[PDB]
Amino acid sequence: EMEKEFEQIDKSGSWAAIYQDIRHEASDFPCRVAKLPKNKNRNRYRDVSPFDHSRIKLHQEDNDYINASLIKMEEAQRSYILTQGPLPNTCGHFWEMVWEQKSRGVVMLNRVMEKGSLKCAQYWPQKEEKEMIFEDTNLKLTLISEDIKSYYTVRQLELENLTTQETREILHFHYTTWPDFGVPESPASFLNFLFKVRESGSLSPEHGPVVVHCSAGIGRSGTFCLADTCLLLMDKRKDPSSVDIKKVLLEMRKFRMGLIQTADQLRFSYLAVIEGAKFIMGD
Ligand SMILES: [Mg+2]
C-alpha cells in the first residue's frame, strides 16, 4: 500500500530524494521540431518542449507546431493533451487545436497573473456581448455563461468554425485558488474540482482528449493527470494497492518532459490520490 509508503518518506523527510530518482530515471526523447528557429516564438519557456513523437500537430500547411503533448494512458483508457498557457500570438493556434482534436473541456490550473507577472494570455471572453475572433485560424469564441465558485469557475463557451459555420460547446474549468508559492494545504478542493471535471463528461472517450494547462503545462497540469489516472486504475484493478504512483508518473513522462516540477508537488499528488481513494472504495 502507498499510504504506508507516504508515512515512511514523510517520517524521514526524504521527498527530495524520491523526486531525484524520478528525475534521473525519466525518459529523454528528441524535441527537434520545438527547437527550430521558426518556432522560437511559439514556446513560452526555452527549457519546456514537447517530444517529437507525442507532440500535437496543427492541421496547417505552413507551420504545424504547437507546444502541446498527447499523453496516452492505455490501461486507464484516458488521454490528455498537456499544453502551455497560450501566448499572445498562439491563442488562435490553441483554439484551432481544441477544434481539430474534438476536445470538450479545457482545464486551466493557473491565474493569468501570478507573482506579479503574466503566466498566460487572456484567451477567452470576459463578457457575453464581447466575443473574440481569431483571424489567423478563422474561429469565433463566445462566452455563454459563467459560474463562479469559491475555489473554481466553470464557463460554457461556444466555438464556431467560421469556415464551416459549425459550432461546438466547450467547457472551461478554471481552478483559481492554487497558491502563488507551494501547493494547497489540503487536497480537498483539488479533488472536488477533479470530480466536477469528471462529472461533465469531458474526460470520456466519446470526446477528444481534454486540454490541460498551467503556465508551462508540466507542474500543476502533471498533478491533475497523475491523480486522475491513478484513481481510475484503482477502480479498475483487482488489487487497488497495486497502483504505484512513481511508476505511473514515469510512464506519463515518456510523453511529456518534466511532469511534476517539485518534491512538494510529488507529495501533494500522493496526498490527493490517498484521500481520493476514500471515495473510490465506496465511501
Ligand atoms: Mg455583464
PDB file of C-alpha atoms and ligand atoms in Angstrom:
ATOM      1  CA  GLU A   1       0.000   0.000   0.000  1.00  0.00           C
ATOM      2  CA  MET A   2       1.105   3.580  -0.645  1.00  0.00           C
ATOM      3  CA  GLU A   3      -0.459   5.083   2.477  1.00  0.00           C
ATOM      4  CA  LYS A   4       2.321   3.302   4.332  1.00  0.00           C
ATOM      5  CA  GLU A   5       4.873   4.406   1.721  1.00  0.00           C
ATOM      6  CA  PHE A   6       3.767   8.021   2.322  1.00  0.00           C
ATOM      7  CA  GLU A   7       4.484   7.917   6.055  1.00  0.00           C
ATOM      8  CA  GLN A   8       7.969   6.479   5.547  1.00  0.00           C
ATOM      9  CA  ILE A   9       9.036   9.231   3.155  1.00  0.00           C
ATOM     10  CA  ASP A  10       7.454  11.887   5.354  1.00  0.00           C
ATOM     11  CA  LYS A  11       8.932  10.499   8.599  1.00  0.00           C
ATOM     12  CA  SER A  12      12.425  10.541   7.053  1.00  0.00           C
ATOM     13  CA  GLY A  13      11.763  13.803   5.158  1.00  0.00           C
ATOM     14  CA  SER A  14      13.188  12.180   2.024  1.00  0.00           C
ATOM     15  CA  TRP A  15      10.814  13.634  -0.583  1.00  0.00           C
ATOM     16  CA  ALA A  16      13.621  15.459  -2.370  1.00  0.00           C
ATOM     17  CA  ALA A  17      15.397  12.081  -2.638  1.00  0.00           C
ATOM     18  CA  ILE A  18      12.422  10.229  -4.140  1.00  0.00           C
ATOM     19  CA  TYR A  19      11.928  13.126  -6.545  1.00  0.00           C
ATOM     20  CA  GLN A  20      15.538  12.948  -7.757  1.00  0.00           C
ATOM     21  CA  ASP A  21      15.418   9.218  -8.550  1.00  0.00           C
ATOM     22  CA  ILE A  22      12.376  10.005 -10.699  1.00  0.00           C
ATOM     23  CA  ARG A  23      14.319  12.741 -12.483  1.00  0.00           C
ATOM     24  CA  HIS A  24      17.330  10.540 -13.239  1.00  0.00           C
ATOM     25  CA  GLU A  25      15.153   7.650 -14.441  1.00  0.00           C
ATOM     26  CA  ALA A  26      12.804   9.743 -16.652  1.00  0.00           C
ATOM     27  CA  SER A  27      12.843   9.271 -20.412  1.00  0.00           C
ATOM     28  CA  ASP A  28      14.536  11.632 -22.818  1.00  0.00           C
ATOM     29  CA  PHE A  29      13.442  11.835 -26.434  1.00  0.00           C
ATOM     30  CA  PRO A  30      14.226  14.310 -29.194  1.00  0.00           C
ATOM     31  CA  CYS A  31      12.393  17.638 -29.368  1.00  0.00           C
ATOM     32  CA  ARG A  32      13.725  18.765 -32.749  1.00  0.00           C
ATOM     33  CA  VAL A  33      10.618  20.490 -34.108  1.00  0.00           C
ATOM     34  CA  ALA A  34      10.278  22.598 -30.933  1.00  0.00           C
ATOM     35  CA  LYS A  35      13.848  23.866 -31.229  1.00  0.00           C
ATOM     36  CA  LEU A  36      13.640  25.002 -34.828  1.00  0.00           C
ATOM     37  CA  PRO A  37      14.239  28.742 -35.074  1.00  0.00           C
ATOM     38  CA  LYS A  38      10.892  29.422 -36.770  1.00  0.00           C
ATOM     39  CA  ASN A  39       9.168  28.092 -33.612  1.00  0.00           C
ATOM     40  CA  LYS A  40      11.083  30.058 -31.011  1.00  0.00           C
ATOM     41  CA  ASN A  41       8.191  32.474 -30.516  1.00  0.00           C
ATOM     42  CA  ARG A  42       5.696  29.585 -30.117  1.00  0.00           C
ATOM     43  CA  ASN A  43       7.386  28.475 -26.880  1.00  0.00           C
ATOM     44  CA  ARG A  44       6.789  30.199 -23.596  1.00  0.00           C
ATOM     45  CA  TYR A  45       9.831  28.651 -21.890  1.00  0.00           C
ATOM     46  CA  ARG A  46      13.067  27.666 -23.587  1.00  0.00           C
ATOM     47  CA  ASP A  47      13.539  24.566 -21.432  1.00  0.00           C
ATOM     48  CA  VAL A  48       9.973  23.138 -21.805  1.00  0.00           C
ATOM     49  CA  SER A  49       9.390  21.425 -25.122  1.00  0.00           C
ATOM     50  CA  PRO A  50       7.184  18.660 -26.459  1.00  0.00           C
ATOM     51  CA  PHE A  51       8.874  15.447 -27.604  1.00  0.00           C
ATOM     52  CA  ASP A  52       8.592  14.964 -31.346  1.00  0.00           C
ATOM     53  CA  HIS A  53       6.922  11.574 -31.021  1.00  0.00           C
ATOM     54  CA  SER A  54       3.943  12.711 -28.858  1.00  0.00           C
ATOM     55  CA  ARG A  55       3.529  16.312 -29.991  1.00  0.00           C
ATOM     56  CA  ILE A  56       0.199  17.596 -31.259  1.00  0.00           C
ATOM     57  CA  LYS A  57       0.266  18.737 -34.853  1.00  0.00           C
ATOM     58  CA  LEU A  58      -1.916  21.539 -36.145  1.00  0.00           C
ATOM     59  CA  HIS A  59      -3.631  20.882 -39.493  1.00  0.00           C
ATOM     60  CA  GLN A  60      -1.919  23.940 -41.018  1.00  0.00           C
ATOM     61  CA  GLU A  61       0.364  23.504 -44.014  1.00  0.00           C
ATOM     62  CA  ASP A  62       2.568  26.477 -43.139  1.00  0.00           C
ATOM     63  CA  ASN A  63       3.614  25.532 -39.597  1.00  0.00           C
ATOM     64  CA  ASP A  64       2.041  22.691 -37.660  1.00  0.00           C
ATOM     65  CA  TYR A  65       3.799  23.380 -34.384  1.00  0.00           C
ATOM     66  CA  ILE A  66       2.185  23.972 -31.000  1.00  0.00           C
ATOM     67  CA  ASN A  67       3.757  23.327 -27.641  1.00  0.00           C
ATOM     68  CA  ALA A  68       1.362  20.547 -26.689  1.00  0.00           C
ATOM     69  CA  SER A  69       1.777  16.808 -25.989  1.00  0.00           C
ATOM     70  CA  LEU A  70      -0.639  13.859 -26.177  1.00  0.00           C
ATOM     71  CA  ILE A  71      -0.408  11.678 -23.080  1.00  0.00           C
ATOM     72  CA  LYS A  72      -1.979   8.254 -23.715  1.00  0.00           C
ATOM     73  CA  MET A  73      -2.645   6.022 -20.669  1.00  0.00           C
ATOM     74  CA  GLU A  74      -3.551   2.752 -22.260  1.00  0.00           C
ATOM     75  CA  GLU A  75      -4.568   0.739 -19.186  1.00  0.00           C
ATOM     76  CA  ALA A  76      -6.693   3.585 -17.771  1.00  0.00           C
ATOM     77  CA  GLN A  77      -8.377   4.357 -21.106  1.00  0.00           C
ATOM     78  CA  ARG A  78      -7.560   8.045 -20.593  1.00  0.00           C
ATOM     79  CA  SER A  79      -5.966  10.524 -22.963  1.00  0.00           C
ATOM     80  CA  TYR A  80      -4.929  14.099 -22.139  1.00  0.00           C
ATOM     81  CA  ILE A  81      -3.415  16.962 -24.086  1.00  0.00           C
ATOM     82  CA  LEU A  82      -0.971  18.923 -21.945  1.00  0.00           C
ATOM     83  CA  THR A  83      -0.017  22.343 -23.211  1.00  0.00           C
ATOM     84  CA  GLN A  84       1.475  25.635 -22.102  1.00  0.00           C
ATOM     85  CA  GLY A  85      -0.613  28.687 -21.325  1.00  0.00           C
ATOM     86  CA  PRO A  86      -1.185  30.377 -24.701  1.00  0.00           C
ATOM     87  CA  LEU A  87       0.933  33.299 -25.652  1.00  0.00           C
ATOM     88  CA  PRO A  88      -0.398  36.485 -27.256  1.00  0.00           C
ATOM     89  CA  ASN A  89       0.473  35.071 -30.650  1.00  0.00           C
ATOM     90  CA  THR A  90      -0.675  31.467 -30.095  1.00  0.00           C
ATOM     91  CA  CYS A  91      -4.261  31.973 -28.866  1.00  0.00           C
ATOM     92  CA  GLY A  92      -5.567  31.157 -32.323  1.00  0.00           C
ATOM     93  CA  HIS A  93      -3.410  28.015 -32.524  1.00  0.00           C
ATOM     94  CA  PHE A  94      -4.733  26.926 -29.123  1.00  0.00           C
ATOM     95  CA  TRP A  95      -8.360  27.094 -30.184  1.00  0.00           C
ATOM     96  CA  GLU A  96      -7.533  25.503 -33.516  1.00  0.00           C
ATOM     97  CA  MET A  97      -6.063  22.551 -31.619  1.00  0.00           C
ATOM     98  CA  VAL A  98      -9.187  22.310 -29.434  1.00  0.00           C
ATOM     99  CA  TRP A  99     -11.302  22.263 -32.589  1.00  0.00           C
ATOM    100  CA  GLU A 100      -9.161  19.765 -34.520  1.00  0.00           C
ATOM    101  CA  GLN A 101      -8.806  17.352 -31.615  1.00  0.00           C
ATOM    102  CA  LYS A 102     -12.555  17.439 -30.800  1.00  0.00           C
ATOM    103  CA  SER A 103     -11.931  18.247 -27.179  1.00  0.00           C
ATOM    104  CA  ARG A 104     -14.927  19.005 -24.964  1.00  0.00           C
ATOM    105  CA  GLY A 105     -13.146  20.535 -21.977  1.00  0.00           C
ATOM    106  CA  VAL A 106     -10.238  22.844 -21.134  1.00  0.00           C
ATOM    107  CA  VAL A 107      -8.757  22.631 -17.646  1.00  0.00           C
ATOM    108  CA  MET A 108      -6.807  25.699 -16.505  1.00  0.00           C
ATOM    109  CA  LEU A 109      -4.851  25.486 -13.289  1.00  0.00           C
ATOM    110  CA  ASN A 110      -3.240  28.949 -13.084  1.00  0.00           C
ATOM    111  CA  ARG A 111      -4.267  32.595 -12.937  1.00  0.00           C
ATOM    112  CA  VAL A 112      -3.488  34.950 -15.770  1.00  0.00           C
ATOM    113  CA  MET A 113      -1.275  36.942 -13.403  1.00  0.00           C
ATOM    114  CA  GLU A 114       0.761  35.265 -10.694  1.00  0.00           C
ATOM    115  CA  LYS A 115       3.663  36.643  -8.689  1.00  0.00           C
ATOM    116  CA  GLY A 116       3.162  39.964 -10.470  1.00  0.00           C
ATOM    117  CA  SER A 117       3.860  38.605 -13.984  1.00  0.00           C
ATOM    118  CA  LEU A 118       1.730  37.296 -16.837  1.00  0.00           C
ATOM    119  CA  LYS A 119       1.596  33.493 -16.891  1.00  0.00           C
ATOM    120  CA  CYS A 120      -0.965  33.141 -19.709  1.00  0.00           C
ATOM    121  CA  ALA A 121      -2.779  35.262 -22.298  1.00  0.00           C
ATOM    122  CA  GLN A 122      -6.424  36.085 -21.673  1.00  0.00           C
ATOM    123  CA  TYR A 123      -7.620  33.641 -24.348  1.00  0.00           C
ATOM    124  CA  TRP A 124     -11.396  33.544 -23.586  1.00  0.00           C
ATOM    125  CA  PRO A 125     -14.017  36.346 -23.462  1.00  0.00           C
ATOM    126  CA  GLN A 126     -14.871  38.071 -20.240  1.00  0.00           C
ATOM    127  CA  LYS A 127     -18.375  39.238 -21.209  1.00  0.00           C
ATOM    128  CA  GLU A 128     -21.211  37.594 -23.151  1.00  0.00           C
ATOM    129  CA  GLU A 129     -21.579  40.542 -25.532  1.00  0.00           C
ATOM    130  CA  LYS A 130     -17.845  40.860 -26.410  1.00  0.00           C
ATOM    131  CA  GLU A 131     -16.925  37.759 -28.377  1.00  0.00           C
ATOM    132  CA  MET A 132     -13.372  37.039 -29.622  1.00  0.00           C
ATOM    133  CA  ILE A 133     -12.331  36.358 -33.193  1.00  0.00           C
ATOM    134  CA  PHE A 134      -9.069  34.620 -34.052  1.00  0.00           C
ATOM    135  CA  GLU A 135      -8.404  35.896 -37.566  1.00  0.00           C
ATOM    136  CA  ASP A 136      -5.423  33.628 -38.269  1.00  0.00           C
ATOM    137  CA  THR A 137      -7.376  30.384 -37.647  1.00  0.00           C
ATOM    138  CA  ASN A 138     -10.894  31.568 -38.547  1.00  0.00           C
ATOM    139  CA  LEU A 139     -12.519  30.816 -35.213  1.00  0.00           C
ATOM    140  CA  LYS A 140     -15.084  32.717 -33.168  1.00  0.00           C
ATOM    141  CA  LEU A 141     -15.419  32.251 -29.420  1.00  0.00           C
ATOM    142  CA  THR A 142     -18.366  33.447 -27.320  1.00  0.00           C
ATOM    143  CA  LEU A 143     -18.921  33.299 -23.597  1.00  0.00           C
ATOM    144  CA  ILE A 144     -22.357  31.725 -22.973  1.00  0.00           C
ATOM    145  CA  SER A 145     -22.369  31.509 -19.190  1.00  0.00           C
ATOM    146  CA  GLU A 146     -20.011  31.713 -16.241  1.00  0.00           C
ATOM    147  CA  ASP A 147     -20.480  30.031 -12.840  1.00  0.00           C
ATOM    148  CA  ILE A 148     -18.091  31.419 -10.228  1.00  0.00           C
ATOM    149  CA  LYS A 149     -17.459  29.413  -7.066  1.00  0.00           C
ATOM    150  CA  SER A 150     -15.088  29.770  -4.156  1.00  0.00           C
ATOM    151  CA  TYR A 151     -12.206  27.647  -5.476  1.00  0.00           C
ATOM    152  CA  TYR A 152     -13.024  27.394  -9.224  1.00  0.00           C
ATOM    153  CA  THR A 153     -15.024  28.856 -12.113  1.00  0.00           C
ATOM    154  CA  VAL A 154     -16.815  26.915 -14.858  1.00  0.00           C
ATOM    155  CA  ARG A 155     -17.606  28.596 -18.142  1.00  0.00           C
ATOM    156  CA  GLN A 156     -19.633  27.474 -21.133  1.00  0.00           C
ATOM    157  CA  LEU A 157     -18.127  28.691 -24.365  1.00  0.00           C
ATOM    158  CA  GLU A 158     -19.306  28.404 -27.938  1.00  0.00           C
ATOM    159  CA  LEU A 159     -16.599  27.793 -30.515  1.00  0.00           C
ATOM    160  CA  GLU A 160     -17.585  28.432 -34.102  1.00  0.00           C
ATOM    161  CA  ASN A 161     -15.575  27.395 -37.111  1.00  0.00           C
ATOM    162  CA  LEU A 162     -16.201  30.352 -39.381  1.00  0.00           C
ATOM    163  CA  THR A 163     -15.165  28.366 -42.458  1.00  0.00           C
ATOM    164  CA  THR A 164     -17.715  25.579 -41.990  1.00  0.00           C
ATOM    165  CA  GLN A 165     -20.136  27.511 -39.769  1.00  0.00           C
ATOM    166  CA  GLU A 166     -20.163  24.516 -37.400  1.00  0.00           C
ATOM    167  CA  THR A 167     -20.280  25.224 -33.676  1.00  0.00           C
ATOM    168  CA  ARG A 168     -19.353  23.282 -30.581  1.00  0.00           C
ATOM    169  CA  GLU A 169     -19.844  23.862 -26.913  1.00  0.00           C
ATOM    170  CA  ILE A 170     -16.639  23.833 -24.858  1.00  0.00           C
ATOM    171  CA  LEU A 171     -16.467  23.782 -21.093  1.00  0.00           C
ATOM    172  CA  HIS A 172     -13.712  25.793 -19.384  1.00  0.00           C
ATOM    173  CA  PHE A 173     -12.814  24.579 -15.883  1.00  0.00           C
ATOM    174  CA  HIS A 174     -10.648  27.131 -14.109  1.00  0.00           C
ATOM    175  CA  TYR A 175      -9.090  26.310 -10.769  1.00  0.00           C
ATOM    176  CA  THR A 176      -8.438  29.748  -9.306  1.00  0.00           C
ATOM    177  CA  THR A 177      -7.027  29.079  -5.823  1.00  0.00           C
ATOM    178  CA  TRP A 178      -3.716  27.374  -6.412  1.00  0.00           C
ATOM    179  CA  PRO A 179      -1.279  29.395  -4.263  1.00  0.00           C
ATOM    180  CA  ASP A 180       1.461  31.538  -5.841  1.00  0.00           C
ATOM    181  CA  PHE A 181       4.055  29.506  -3.868  1.00  0.00           C
ATOM    182  CA  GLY A 182       3.964  25.833  -2.923  1.00  0.00           C
ATOM    183  CA  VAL A 183       0.889  23.603  -3.065  1.00  0.00           C
ATOM    184  CA  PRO A 184      -2.573  23.698  -1.478  1.00  0.00           C
ATOM    185  CA  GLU A 185      -2.635  22.728   2.158  1.00  0.00           C
ATOM    186  CA  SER A 186      -5.375  20.116   1.683  1.00  0.00           C
ATOM    187  CA  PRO A 187      -6.300  18.217  -1.500  1.00  0.00           C
ATOM    188  CA  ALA A 188      -9.996  18.581  -0.750  1.00  0.00           C
ATOM    189  CA  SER A 189     -10.773  21.451  -3.102  1.00  0.00           C
ATOM    190  CA  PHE A 190      -8.470  19.981  -5.754  1.00  0.00           C
ATOM    191  CA  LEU A 191     -10.291  16.618  -5.595  1.00  0.00           C
ATOM    192  CA  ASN A 192     -13.632  18.377  -5.671  1.00  0.00           C
ATOM    193  CA  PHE A 193     -12.554  20.174  -8.871  1.00  0.00           C
ATOM    194  CA  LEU A 194     -11.309  16.939 -10.420  1.00  0.00           C
ATOM    195  CA  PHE A 195     -14.633  15.196  -9.768  1.00  0.00           C
ATOM    196  CA  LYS A 196     -16.504  18.106 -11.300  1.00  0.00           C
ATOM    197  CA  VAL A 197     -14.435  17.770 -14.468  1.00  0.00           C
ATOM    198  CA  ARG A 198     -15.167  14.044 -14.494  1.00  0.00           C
ATOM    199  CA  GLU A 199     -18.901  14.630 -13.997  1.00  0.00           C
ATOM    200  CA  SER A 200     -19.079  16.916 -17.026  1.00  0.00           C
ATOM    201  CA  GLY A 201     -18.218  14.127 -19.459  1.00  0.00           C
ATOM    202  CA  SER A 202     -15.063  15.952 -20.635  1.00  0.00           C
ATOM    203  CA  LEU A 203     -12.765  13.015 -19.818  1.00  0.00           C
ATOM    204  CA  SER A 204     -14.907  10.468 -21.514  1.00  0.00           C
ATOM    205  CA  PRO A 205     -13.879   8.518 -24.606  1.00  0.00           C
ATOM    206  CA  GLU A 206     -16.738   9.721 -26.781  1.00  0.00           C
ATOM    207  CA  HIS A 207     -14.870  13.052 -26.888  1.00  0.00           C
ATOM    208  CA  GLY A 208     -11.458  14.146 -27.924  1.00  0.00           C
ATOM    209  CA  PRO A 209      -8.858  14.392 -25.181  1.00  0.00           C
ATOM    210  CA  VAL A 210      -9.236  17.073 -22.573  1.00  0.00           C
ATOM    211  CA  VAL A 211      -6.850  20.023 -22.855  1.00  0.00           C
ATOM    212  CA  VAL A 212      -4.986  20.688 -19.573  1.00  0.00           C
ATOM    213  CA  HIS A 213      -2.670  23.629 -18.961  1.00  0.00           C
ATOM    214  CA  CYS A 214      -0.950  25.798 -16.366  1.00  0.00           C
ATOM    215  CA  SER A 215       1.860  28.148 -17.341  1.00  0.00           C
ATOM    216  CA  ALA A 216       4.369  25.585 -18.597  1.00  0.00           C
ATOM    217  CA  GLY A 217       1.975  22.631 -18.829  1.00  0.00           C
ATOM    218  CA  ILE A 218       4.079  20.300 -16.651  1.00  0.00           C
ATOM    219  CA  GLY A 219       3.748  21.104 -12.967  1.00  0.00           C
ATOM    220  CA  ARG A 220       0.175  21.631 -11.804  1.00  0.00           C
ATOM    221  CA  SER A 221      -1.002  20.049 -15.075  1.00  0.00           C
ATOM    222  CA  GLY A 222       1.018  16.926 -14.273  1.00  0.00           C
ATOM    223  CA  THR A 223      -0.555  16.725 -10.809  1.00  0.00           C
ATOM    224  CA  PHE A 224      -4.057  16.784 -12.291  1.00  0.00           C
ATOM    225  CA  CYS A 225      -3.454  13.975 -14.801  1.00  0.00           C
ATOM    226  CA  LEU A 226      -1.450  11.830 -12.397  1.00  0.00           C
ATOM    227  CA  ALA A 227      -4.159  11.943  -9.710  1.00  0.00           C
ATOM    228  CA  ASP A 228      -6.953  11.234 -12.215  1.00  0.00           C
ATOM    229  CA  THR A 229      -5.163   8.253 -13.819  1.00  0.00           C
ATOM    230  CA  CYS A 230      -4.095   6.743 -10.501  1.00  0.00           C
ATOM    231  CA  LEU A 231      -7.635   6.952  -9.134  1.00  0.00           C
ATOM    232  CA  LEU A 232      -9.007   5.393 -12.311  1.00  0.00           C
ATOM    233  CA  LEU A 233      -6.553   2.480 -12.137  1.00  0.00           C
ATOM    234  CA  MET A 234      -7.661   1.814  -8.534  1.00  0.00           C
ATOM    235  CA  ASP A 235     -11.276   1.497  -9.743  1.00  0.00           C
ATOM    236  CA  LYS A 236     -10.268  -0.932 -12.470  1.00  0.00           C
ATOM    237  CA  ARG A 237      -7.745  -3.282 -10.826  1.00  0.00           C
ATOM    238  CA  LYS A 238      -8.495  -6.433  -8.727  1.00  0.00           C
ATOM    239  CA  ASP A 239      -5.859  -5.225  -6.193  1.00  0.00           C
ATOM    240  CA  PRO A 240      -6.146  -1.399  -5.682  1.00  0.00           C
ATOM    241  CA  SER A 241      -2.858  -1.196  -3.718  1.00  0.00           C
ATOM    242  CA  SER A 242      -1.019  -2.443  -6.832  1.00  0.00           C
ATOM    243  CA  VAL A 243      -1.023   1.140  -8.156  1.00  0.00           C
ATOM    244  CA  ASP A 244       2.465   2.628  -7.915  1.00  0.00           C
ATOM    245  CA  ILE A 245       2.339   6.426  -8.256  1.00  0.00           C
ATOM    246  CA  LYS A 246       6.025   6.549  -9.173  1.00  0.00           C
ATOM    247  CA  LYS A 247       5.560   4.045 -11.990  1.00  0.00           C
ATOM    248  CA  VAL A 248       2.533   5.865 -13.321  1.00  0.00           C
ATOM    249  CA  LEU A 249       4.451   9.139 -13.316  1.00  0.00           C
ATOM    250  CA  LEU A 250       7.383   7.664 -15.225  1.00  0.00           C
ATOM    251  CA  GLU A 251       5.002   6.248 -17.847  1.00  0.00           C
ATOM    252  CA  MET A 252       3.475   9.718 -18.289  1.00  0.00           C
ATOM    253  CA  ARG A 253       6.943  11.280 -18.556  1.00  0.00           C
ATOM    254  CA  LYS A 254       7.520   9.236 -21.692  1.00  0.00           C
ATOM    255  CA  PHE A 255       5.023  11.585 -23.338  1.00  0.00           C
ATOM    256  CA  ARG A 256       5.980  14.973 -21.920  1.00  0.00           C
ATOM    257  CA  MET A 257       9.050  16.025 -20.006  1.00  0.00           C
ATOM    258  CA  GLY A 258       9.116  17.351 -16.504  1.00  0.00           C
ATOM    259  CA  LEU A 259       5.645  16.433 -15.282  1.00  0.00           C
ATOM    260  CA  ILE A 260       5.614  17.263 -11.539  1.00  0.00           C
ATOM    261  CA  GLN A 261       8.108  20.063 -11.088  1.00  0.00           C
ATOM    262  CA  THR A 262       8.899  19.922  -7.349  1.00  0.00           C
ATOM    263  CA  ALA A 263       9.138  17.459  -4.483  1.00  0.00           C
ATOM    264  CA  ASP A 264       6.302  19.438  -2.924  1.00  0.00           C
ATOM    265  CA  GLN A 265       4.111  18.631  -5.933  1.00  0.00           C
ATOM    266  CA  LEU A 266       5.012  14.946  -5.695  1.00  0.00           C
ATOM    267  CA  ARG A 267       3.995  14.832  -2.042  1.00  0.00           C
ATOM    268  CA  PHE A 268       0.756  16.647  -2.865  1.00  0.00           C
ATOM    269  CA  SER A 269      -0.027  14.100  -5.580  1.00  0.00           C
ATOM    270  CA  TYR A 270       0.350  11.209  -3.147  1.00  0.00           C
ATOM    271  CA  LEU A 271      -1.924  13.054  -0.747  1.00  0.00           C
ATOM    272  CA  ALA A 272      -4.645  13.657  -3.320  1.00  0.00           C
ATOM    273  CA  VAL A 273      -4.604  10.059  -4.505  1.00  0.00           C
ATOM    274  CA  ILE A 274      -4.710   8.691  -0.956  1.00  0.00           C
ATOM    275  CA  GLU A 275      -7.579  10.978   0.029  1.00  0.00           C
ATOM    276  CA  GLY A 276      -9.378  10.351  -3.231  1.00  0.00           C
ATOM    277  CA  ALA A 277      -9.151   6.608  -2.616  1.00  0.00           C
ATOM    278  CA  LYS A 278     -11.656   7.053   0.251  1.00  0.00           C
ATOM    279  CA  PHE A 279     -14.431   7.945  -2.218  1.00  0.00           C
ATOM    280  CA  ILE A 280     -13.403   5.375  -4.915  1.00  0.00           C
ATOM    281  CA  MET A 281     -13.563   2.482  -2.401  1.00  0.00           C
ATOM    282  CA  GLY A 282     -17.282   3.163  -1.945  1.00  0.00           C
ATOM    283  CA  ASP A 283     -17.368   5.750   0.812  1.00  0.00           C
TER     284      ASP A 283
HETATM  285 MG    MG B   1     -22.151  41.761 -17.783  1.00  0.00          MG
END
